[PDB]
Design a protein around this ligand. Structure first.
Ligand SMILES: CCCCCCCCCCC(CCCCCCCCCC)(CO[C@H]1O[C@@H](CO)[C@H](O[C@@H]2O[C@@H](CO)[C@H](O)[C@@H](O)[C@@H]2O)[C@@H](O)[C@@H]1O)CO[C@H]1O[C@@H](CO)[C@H](O[C@@H]2O[C@@H](CO)[C@H](O)[C@@H](O)[C@@H]2O)[C@@H](O)[C@H]1O
Ligand SMILES: CCCCC/C=C/C/C=C/C/C=C\C/C=C\CCCC(=O)O[C@H](COC(=O)CCCCCCCCCCCCCCCCC)COP(=O)(O)O[C@@H]1[C@H](O)[C@H](O)[C@@H](O)[C@H](O)[C@H]1O
Ligand SMILES: CCCCC/C=C/C/C=C/C/C=C\C/C=C\CCCC(=O)O[C@H](COC(=O)CCCCCCCCCCCCCCCCC)COP(=O)(O)O[C@@H]1[C@H](O)[C@H](O)[C@@H](O)[C@H](O)[C@H]1O
Ligand SMILES: CCCCC/C=C/C/C=C\CCCCCCCC(=O)O[C@H](COC(=O)CCCCCCCCCCCCCCC)COP(=O)([O-])OCC[N+](C)(C)C
Ligand SMILES: CCCCCCCCCCCCCCCCCC(=O)OC[C@H](COP(=O)(O)OCCN)OC(=O)CCCCCCCCCCCCCCCCC
Ligand SMILES: CCCCCCCCCCCCCCCCCC(=O)OC[C@H](COP(=O)(O)OCCN)OC(=O)CCCCCCCCCCCCCCCCC
Ligand SMILES: CCCCCCCCCCCCCCCCCC(=O)OC[C@H](COP(=O)(O)OCCN)OC(=O)CCCCCCCCCCCCCCCCC
Ligand SMILES: CCCCCCCCCCCCCCCCCC(=O)OC[C@H](COP(=O)(O)OCCN)OC(=O)CCCCCCCCCCCCCCCCC
Ligand SMILES: CCCCCCCCCCCCCCCCCC(=O)OC[C@H](COP(=O)(O)OCCN)OC(=O)CCCCCCCCCCCCCCCCC
Lengths: 182, 481, 178, 89, 469, 60
């Protein structure tokens, strides 16, 4: 994506130059000047350059475009704040319903929020490898290794028999590890 | 990469002029990267995993591949991963909560906020006493500048408090760390439970560590700086200070104190319980007579920290799990309450006195609903992580000492009192005469609040979802023969 | 512990405080502006001689008295001595809050001084640099600066006491069946 | 399903960190197995009570007594007590 | 190299016109730099801590003295740049900063005296070097003789330094009367046990230490610092302190001294508390110097002090140079020039400096936080090394007093930054004249050292282990 | 692998501890007169003035 134009920019500056400062540019509330304010402010949401030129070009063009965008943003937002009208459609239409994206939405909804969803999914499935399940299986395997005949028993009897063996006998190894306590 | 990414930063700054979109993007990438690390984190192992060393003599500007370790060590276990996740969840929200209300010199403001976040995140990676202490102190000048330049009317006194109190406690911690350094000639957290100092020297080292803990938590009676600092700070400062920085003290108890000074800790536990019970009761009662919204919210954090302390010093697995869960849930809910009082109401009316506010429900029903939800979350309504943390902390405290934990059970009531006294006046009655009608909560404010509420609800319904990172931790630090 | 002779030591303190106050009065007389004669040195002393004498008496007498009564020597005696000294110095304010503040805060500062060893330089023989350090040998008793990998469980039971998890025998060994 | 080899604090040299880590993990895992045994006893007790009703006092006496016996001894206790103390001395 | 420079400079300056002054200084500046980079390799002589007695045992050369000599050369380079290079090219700055004809010679002779103090192995060498440095410093204080304050300061310096020189001479002669010797090398453990030298050696220590202004004899030197021209103050408050402290560190004649312990405590308390009500920048910096002198005084109580002393003195010298340079740079942005010798006097004149030059205030913040001791700035590691040293040797009460003094002095350090980041009503829009490239680069190099030097900490310790063990 | 890496790091840390204790001890060992004072003229015994050198003034 490349979208810059120095030719357009150096003239946009003068098209700004005729206008009053954006602080005082709407304090009348004629309609012709307000219409030009509408068009020039509408330029704020018409994106003027992409990546291939911010990366490649030089800082004089950058400083000029930066300045232009500063005054455009001031005009757009001041008209929107005083008149209650969006500066599109091009003379200051009222149609506020929709078509209003803030500059944080894309990041927070397509990077931050999916990241949080992925974190929740990862926690849910990471909780499956929890020590409580490992120790359940390990107790069962110790019992099955000491008393293999309950393997021969059918499925539905088997679990009751493992439970019986667990209840009767102390299959942990904690005291074994405590060698020096005699 | 670093060269290319610096060029990217420079060009973005040249053309846009506001650094904040780049900072939001960098922090979101950091959160995604931490989630990828969690994906590749082995849970069936109590050993530190993503290790690296900085400023080794053989490679001062690189990573150390040497047989002698003389740089600063970094790495993570499950405990540190928990707090790292909390940190990277919170940082982008602290950027987004000041998106529109910072207008003069905003690039510096966002730089300070992001730097403070990154320093805390690195602090949770530190694997030795010196690296921990360095990242512990490095936040103080950044906070001083941030509060002094972008705080409210009393922000000079506040910046001086946030610097001086924390330096005061940190220097006694520094005495303790120096003593450990010269007595053991080692400073790392990987093997420090293998060194058993004499009980007397243990008793002495504990005092410095605990003075620092007392100022940073804070605990009674050295808490009085926190309401001032919270009240005068800009919103991102308050969110970081209540959600992250106070958790560093709980983490310090687990990481720096319990593994090394076990016997002295046993000896000192009743004194800790005295201090924590005083914190809970006295600060809860002192909250009842406050007239500043942000001060009231700030006072709430101190009592919850007291409950967490009681849990973490209980010498039980349930108490330590409850302390960590309480820390995380507080990190969700307290930044939301600070967002309400110092971000939404304060940006509309520029005042914090309680007498001016009454009956907001009429024009702002959505904000009133958020207030009600966050209030009942803050006082530990079940199905909220706050309830799980408080309940488990009180269980551990009661086992450790039945009388002291039993008396600690009054915090349920006391917190209910101060919080619901505030919300009753905020939502009910006729709309106030002193203020004009403003907009109800915006899409950005609702987004932040929704993130925090969903997080606290998810860990409130199923607290077990943290256990896969913490089940070694709930056994690593208890001292039973 | 054999007792301090409180009376004689305190009399010595009286003499030294009087001398030091006299010296301070002479210096005060020489450093000041305005007319000054040889007798005005005590007239315009500011009571400095009394400051010195009273502090000397209070500190030395109280320290010796507390040491003899407790039959100990440690920082607590200096805490009491500093409390009494602060009482004397805060009496000059003639206000009860200030008198109390001097009492407790001087007592605390002097207790801190006594706890560190009651010296301004170092006790060189006891210091870490002049002491056995590092890991102890085979079965030696651990000394103040030495480190071990395992302490004896009997020592832990003696020092912490039995209860709340500290036991003479590990639990699993004791609850093993046969 | 993993079954790491069990290692005791009493045998190893505290300077091989691999052995010390294995001993700590062994101690913790054995405690979790003990917790599993206690949970098994408790679950059997609940089943016995729910199927016995008014005569649970008779039919579940052994299970009730055994659960109450194992409650104080089959909880998590950590490893620091045993690694930092030598029971022989 | 130094002696040669002094001889050549006397001749050249004698044949030169007053307009050549700055040019001459520039020449000497580059000469010093060359000596630092071509003669550096001589460090190899001291591998494995080999010590050399030189000049019939009048002088001692080891790794410690070689390092101190390099540091003094670096300091002289930095300070002479401030006279050889104009900050701005306007008329006011010509009036503010013009080097005197003989100033460079006085600086080089004073540096010679300092380096001879550092290397002194015999007491006759020590006394000749001390008088060389003292006489030079009096003349440096006086050479701006249109100033009433500077001439009065020079008289006060002459008389107080003369009394202290007499105390030092009397100490040396009592030592001779007891031992029939003029060298500390004749002291052995057996001699120290057998004889009471404590009164003699402490008298010598106090004579040396009052010359750099420890408490309770601090006010006279602080007055001299306040009342000299600022570019003189940068030199005279640093070089003597380094030379005297380095000699006392290397001599180790006051180990576990009770008197030095009490005076160090008093110096820390006086330096921290007495800086609190100061409103003049140079008085504030003088009390800061007093507190840091107390920190270094603590190292005279113990053996094996070399690493912590060298680290502390290096980072302190860097920070002192940086803060004076920042104050000098801020002169361009102030509303009111108080006089031609001290263009800026009051801390309040820095108010709102951030709106005129933001990165100057960033440099100030870094330096101030280093003085306070925030990691990972160099000041933190200096204080950490000192604490390790004193706690290894049992100085517990003094360690607590050190912590308290650090906290107290943080208040007056933060005063500078506090006023500097407030708002001012009329802020700078543009200006055609830029400050000098050379001096700005030097200041930035100092700031970068303070900020990132910690990266080399373990490498530095490795080298220290082979040159000082 | 996690255990092996952690053990290697702990070994390097113990190596650094051993080196620190070794340098501490070596720095406190007393050096020879040649290494500490004078490596060429290495005899500490003085000769004094040579003018009126008196037979019998030399004493070991
Ligand atoms: C965060 C708050 C900071 C404030 C708290 C600091 C308080 C420091 C106090 C503790 C400590 C320094 C420890 C320093 C450790 C690091 C320092 C920590 C940072 C310092 C900032 C000072 O202990 C002092 O306590 C005072 C009493 O209060 C005494 O006062 C005086 O009492 C009277 C004189 O006889 C006079 O009448 C009067 O002169 C005072 O009345 C002092 O003499 C005494 O030295 C203890 O050190 C010492 O402990 C002893 C036995 O423990 C060690 O030797 C042991 O010998 C056997 C038994 O002896 C053991 O069998 C053996 O195993 C072990 O070898 C020593 O080798 C040494 O190490
Ligand atoms: C230019 C003006 C020229 C004027 C010249 C005329 C002046 C002539 C003499 C004055 C010379 C200068 C005077 C300087 C002030 C003297 C103060 C002074 O030296 O420190 C004292 C004097 O220790 C005396 O034992 C000495 C005690 C003092 C002697 C007793 C007082 C007698 C007066 C009788 C009334 C030195 O002990 P110190 O600090 O090391 O203290 C201790 C202690 O000595 C030992 O137990 C420890 O082992 C040791 O490690 C240490 O910690
Ligand atoms: C280990 C610690 C020991 C040493 C570490 C200290 C310093 C680093 C080492 C060496 C320092 C030497 C650096 C040489 C390279 C530095 C360097 O770019 O030139 C200079 C400064 O140059 C020194 O002012 C040279 C001053 C040298 C003295 C610096 C000592 C500090 C800065 O360039 P610059 O573009 O602004 O210079 C331009 C340009 O030269 C002129 O033609 C223009 O007309 C003018 O507008 C000017 O702006
Ligand atoms: C090409 C010639 C250039 C040499 C010119 C040197 C000028 C010195 C000027 C100013 C002093 C600044 C500090 C000197 C550095 C100490 C070196 C050393 O390691 O100090 C050690 C002794 O450590 C100590 O006691 C402690 C020193 C405390 C330093 C505290 C500041 C640390 C921050 C500095 C960061 C380094 C910046 C590097 C930038 C990439 C002596 O080393 P050494 O005596 O064997 O001599 C080195 C070989 N040399 C002659 C060729 C250079
Ligand atoms: C001024 C305050 C004091 C400053 C002192 C400390 C300054 C530190 C400067 C920040 C730099 C630290 C972060 C970068 C280091 C990590 C680089 C790395 O590669 O980590 C190595 C580790 C293992 O990698 P390896 O052994 O090579 O094997 C790879 C197999 N594929 O690979 C990993 O496991 C990944 C490790 C991820 C660590 C997360 C780091 C999060 C924060 C990163 C930026 C923090 C910036 C903070 C800036 C404020 C200053 C504190
Ligand atoms: C108060 C404020 C204080 C601020 C403190 C900040 C200090 C920051 C120091 C930076 C050193 C730490 C850098 C982390 C190391 C990350 C890294 O590895 O960068 C890549 C490269 C070395 O990489 P390598 O050793 O090959 O290991 C990777 C193998 N997979 O690394 C390099 O090539 C060097 C590039 C870094 C250059 C830093 C320059 C200083 C900043 C200007
Ligand atoms: C006969 C034998 C028995 C007597 C022996 C006791 C010797 C002690 C004598 C000391 C006399 C007191 C000295 C003195 O007069 O100090 C006053 C002097 C100026 O004080 P002044 O003018 O009166 O009041 C100002 C108040 N803003 O202030 C000064 O300028 C004097 C400076 C202090 C004196 C040096 C003492 C060094 C030790 C200080 C202890 C520091 C605390 C460390 C713990
Ligand atoms: C941020 C700011 C935070 C700063 C924190 C406060 C700094 C200190 C404030 C002032 C504290 C003054 C303490 C005076 C202590 C009085 C005393 O005499 O202590 C001695 C006492 C016992 O010493 P010992 O002789 O060894 O007796 C052994 C018998 N078991 O020693 C003890 O057992 C300890 C007695 C005091 C307990 C600690 C008090 C709070 C610290
Ligand atoms: C350094 C390496 C790390 C840099 C990390 C961030 C890089 C990009 C920083 C950035 O985005 O710019 C910050 C800020 C904004 O730039 P800018 O718009 O040009 O400023 C307005 C006037 N020109 O630029 C500025 O405005 C500079 C103003 C500096 C303000 C001085 C007060 C802050 C002092 C910071 C305290 C540092 C203390 C250090 C002690 C240890 C800290 C851990």
């Amino acid at each position: 994506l490349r979208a810059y134009n120095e030719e357009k920019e150096l003239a946009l500056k003068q098209r700004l130059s005729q206008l009053p400062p954006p602080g005082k540019a709407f304090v009348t509330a004629k309609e012709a000047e307000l219409a030009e304010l509408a068009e020039i402010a509408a330029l704020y949401k018409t994106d003027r350059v992409g990546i291939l030129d911010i990366l490649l070009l030089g800082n004089k063009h950058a400083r000029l475009y930066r300045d232009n965008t500063a005054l455009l943003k001031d005009y757009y937002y001041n008209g929107r704040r005083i008149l209650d009208k969006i500066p599109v459609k091009v003379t200051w239409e009222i149609k506020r319903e929709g078509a209003e994206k803030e500059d944080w939405v894309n990041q927070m909804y397509f990077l931050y929020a999916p990241s949080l969803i992925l974190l929740l999914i990862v926690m849910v499935y990471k909780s499956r490898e929890d020590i409580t399940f490992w120790a359940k299986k390990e107790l069962d395997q110790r019992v099955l290794d000491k008393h293999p005949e309950i393997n021969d028993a059918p499925e539905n009897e088997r679990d009751a028999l493992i439970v019986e063996r667990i209840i009767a006998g102390d299959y942990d190894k904690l005291a074994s590890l405590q060698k020096k306590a005699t | 990469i670093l060269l290319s990414s610096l060029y990217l930063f420079n060009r973005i700054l040249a053309w846009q002029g506001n650094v904040k979109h780049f900072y939001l993007f960098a922090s979101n990438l950091l959160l995604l990267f931490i989630v990828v690390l969690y994906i590749n984190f082995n849970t069936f192992s109590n050993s530190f995993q993503f290790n690296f060393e900085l400023f080794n003599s053989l490679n001062p500007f690189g990573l150390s591949n040497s047989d002698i370790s003389n740089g600063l060590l970094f790495g993570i276990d499950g405990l540190s991963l928990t707090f790292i996740l909390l940190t990277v969840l919170l940082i982008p929200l602290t950027l987004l909560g000041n998106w529109y209300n910072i207008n003069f010199n905003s690039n510096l403001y966002y730089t300070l906020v992001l730097a403070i976040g990154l320093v805390i995140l690195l602090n949770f990676w530190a694997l030795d006493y010196i690296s921990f202490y360095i990242l512990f102190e490095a936040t103080l000048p950044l906070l001083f500048i941030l509060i002094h330049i972008y705080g409210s009317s009393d922000s000079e006194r506040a910046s001086f408090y946030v610097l001086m109190f924390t330096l005061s406690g940190s220097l006694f911690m520094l005495l303790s760390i120096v003593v450990i350094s010269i007595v053991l000639n080692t400073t790392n957290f990987i093997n420090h439970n293998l060194f058993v100092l004499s009980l007397d020297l243990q008793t002495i080292i504990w005092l410095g560590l605990f003075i620092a803990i007392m100022v940073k938590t804070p605990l009674f009676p050295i808490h009085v700086w926190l309401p001032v600092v919270h009240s005068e700070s800009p919103l991102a400062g308050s969110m970081i200070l209540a959600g992250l920085i106070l958790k560093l003290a709980l983490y310090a108890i687990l990481r720096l104190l319990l593994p090394l000074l076990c016997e002295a800790q046993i000896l000192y536990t009743p004194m800790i319980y005295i201090i924590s019970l005083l914190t809970i009761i006295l600060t809860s009662l002192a909250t009842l007579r406050q007239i500043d919204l942000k001060v009231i919210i700030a006072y709430s954090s101190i009592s919850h920290m007291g409950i967490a302390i009681l849990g973490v010093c209980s010498n039980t697995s349930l108490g330590i799990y409850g302390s960590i869960v309480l820390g995380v849930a507080h990190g969700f809910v307290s930044p939301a309450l600070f967002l309400i009082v110092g971000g939404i109401l304060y940006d509309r009316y520029h005042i914090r006195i309680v007498n001016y506010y009454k009956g907001l429900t009429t024009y702002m029903p959505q904000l009133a609903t958020y207030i009600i939800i966050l209030s009942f979350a803050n006082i530990g309504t079940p199905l909220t992580g706050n309830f799980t943390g408080e309940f488990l902390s009180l269980q551990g405290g009661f086992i450790r000492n039945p009388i002291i934990g039993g008396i600690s059970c009054i915090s349920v009531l006391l917190a209910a009192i101060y919080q619901l006294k505030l919300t009753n006046k905020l939502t009910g009655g006729i709309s106030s005469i002193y203020m004009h009608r403003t907009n109800d909560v915006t899409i950005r404010e609702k987004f932040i609040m929704n993130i925090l509420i969903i997080s606290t609800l998810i860990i409130g319904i199923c607290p077990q979802i943290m256990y896969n990172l913490l089940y070694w931790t709930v056994n690593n630090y208890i001292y039973i023969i | 512990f054999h007792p301090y002779n409180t009376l004689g030591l305190a009399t010595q303190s009286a003499m030294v405080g009087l001398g030091a106050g006299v010296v301070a009065a002479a210096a005060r007389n020489s450093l000041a502006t305005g007319p000054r004669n040889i007798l005005t040195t005590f007239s315009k002393s500011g009571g400095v001689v009394t400051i010195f004498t009273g502090a000397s008496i209070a500190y030395v007498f109280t320290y010796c008295s507390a040491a003899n009564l407790r039959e100990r020597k440690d920082g607590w005696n200096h805490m009491w001595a500093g409390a009494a000294t602060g009482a004397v110095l805060g009496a000059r304010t003639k206000l009860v809050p200030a008198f109390i503040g001097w009492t407790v805060l001087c007592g605390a500062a002097c207790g801190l001084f006594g706890w560190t060893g009651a010296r301004f330089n170092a006790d060189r023989k006891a210091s870490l640099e002049q002491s056995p350090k590092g890991f102890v040998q085979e079965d030696a008793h651990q000394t103040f600066w030495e480190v071990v990998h395992r302490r004896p469980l009997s020592l832990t039971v003696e020092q912490l006491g039995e209860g709340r998890g500290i036991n003479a025998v590990p639990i699993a060994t004791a609850t093993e069946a046969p | 399903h993993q079954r790491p080899e069990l290692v005791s604090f009493d045998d190893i040299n505290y300077n091989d960190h691999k052995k010390v880590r294995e001993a700590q993990e062994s101690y913790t895992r054995e405690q979790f197995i003990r917790l599993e045994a206690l949970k098994t006893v408790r679950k059997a007790l609940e089943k016995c009570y729910e199927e016995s009703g008014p005569n649970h006092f008779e039919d579940c006496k052994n299970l009730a007594e055994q659960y109450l016996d194992m409650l104080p001894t089959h909880r998590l206790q950590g490893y620091l007590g045993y690694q930092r103390n030598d029971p022989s001395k | 190299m130094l002696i040669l420079a002094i001889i050549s400079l006397i001749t050249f300056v004698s044949m030169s016109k007053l307009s050549d002054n700055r040019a001459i200084i520039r020449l000497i500046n580059i000469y010093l730099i060359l000596v630092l980079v071509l003669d550096s390799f001589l460090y190899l002589l001291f591998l494995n801590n080999q010590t050399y007695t030189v000049m019939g045992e009048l002088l001692i050369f080891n790794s410690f003295t070689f390092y101190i000599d390099m540091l003094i050369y670096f300091i002289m380079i930095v300070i002479s740049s401030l006279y050889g290079y104009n900050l701005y090219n306007n008329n006011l700055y010509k009036t503010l900063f013009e080097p005197k004809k003989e100033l460079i010679i006085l600086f080089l002779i004073n540096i010679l005296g300092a380096l001879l103090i550092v290397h002194s192995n015999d007491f006759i060498t020590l006394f000749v070097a001390i008088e060389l440095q003292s006489y030079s410093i009096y003349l440096i204080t006086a050479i701006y003789n249109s100033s009433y304050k500077a001439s009065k300061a020079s008289m006060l310096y002459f008389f107080m330094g003369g009394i202290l020189s007499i105390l030092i001479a009397y100490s040396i002669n009592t030592y001779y009367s007891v031992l029939n010797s003029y060298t500390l090398h004749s002291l052995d453990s057996l001699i120290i046990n057998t004889l009471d030298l404590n009164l003699i050696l402490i008298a010598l220590s106090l004579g040396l230490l009052f010359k750099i202004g420890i408490a309770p004899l601090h006010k006279w030197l602080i007055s001299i610092y306040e009342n000299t021209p600022i570019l003189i103050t940068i030199y005279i408050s640093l070089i003597p302190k380094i030379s005297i402290l380095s000699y006392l560190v290397l001599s180790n004649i006051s180990i576990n001294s009770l008197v030095i312990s009490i005076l160090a405590i008093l110096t820390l308390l006086v330096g921290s508390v007495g800086g609190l009500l100061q409103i003049k920048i140079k008085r504030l910096l003088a009390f800061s110097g007093l507190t840091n002198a107390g920190y270094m005084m603590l190292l005279l109580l113990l053996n094996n002090n070399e690493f912590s002393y060298l680290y502390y003195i290096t980072q302190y010298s860097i920070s002192h140079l940086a803060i004076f340079m920042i104050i000098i740079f801020s002169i361009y942005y102030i509303n009111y020039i108080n006089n031609q010798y001290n263009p800026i006097i009051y801390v309040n004149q820095l108010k709102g400096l951030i709106h005129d030059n933001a990165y100057l205030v960033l440099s100030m913040a870094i330096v101030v936080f280093s003085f306070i001791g925030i990691p990972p700035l160099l000041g933190f590691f200096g204080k950490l090394n000192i604490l390790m040293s004193i706690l290894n040797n049992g100085y517990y009460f003094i360690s607590i007093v050190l912590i308290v003094a650090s906290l107290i002095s943080a208040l007056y350090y933060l005063y500078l930054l506090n006023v500097s980041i407030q708002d001012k009503n009329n802020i700078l829009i543009n200006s055609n004249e830029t400050v000098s490239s050379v001096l700005s680069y030097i200041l930035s190099s100092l700031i970068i050292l303070i900020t990132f030097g910690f990266i080399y900490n373990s490498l530095i310790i490795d080298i220290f282990n082979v040159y000082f063990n | 692998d996690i255990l092996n890496e952690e053990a290697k790091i702990v070994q390097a840390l113990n190596n650094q501890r051993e080196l620190t204790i070794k340098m501490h001890e070596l720095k406190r060992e007393e050096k020879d007169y040649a290494h500490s004072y004078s490596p060429l003229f290495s005899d500490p015994v003085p000769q004094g003035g040579s003018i009126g050198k008196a037979p019998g003034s030399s004493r070991e």
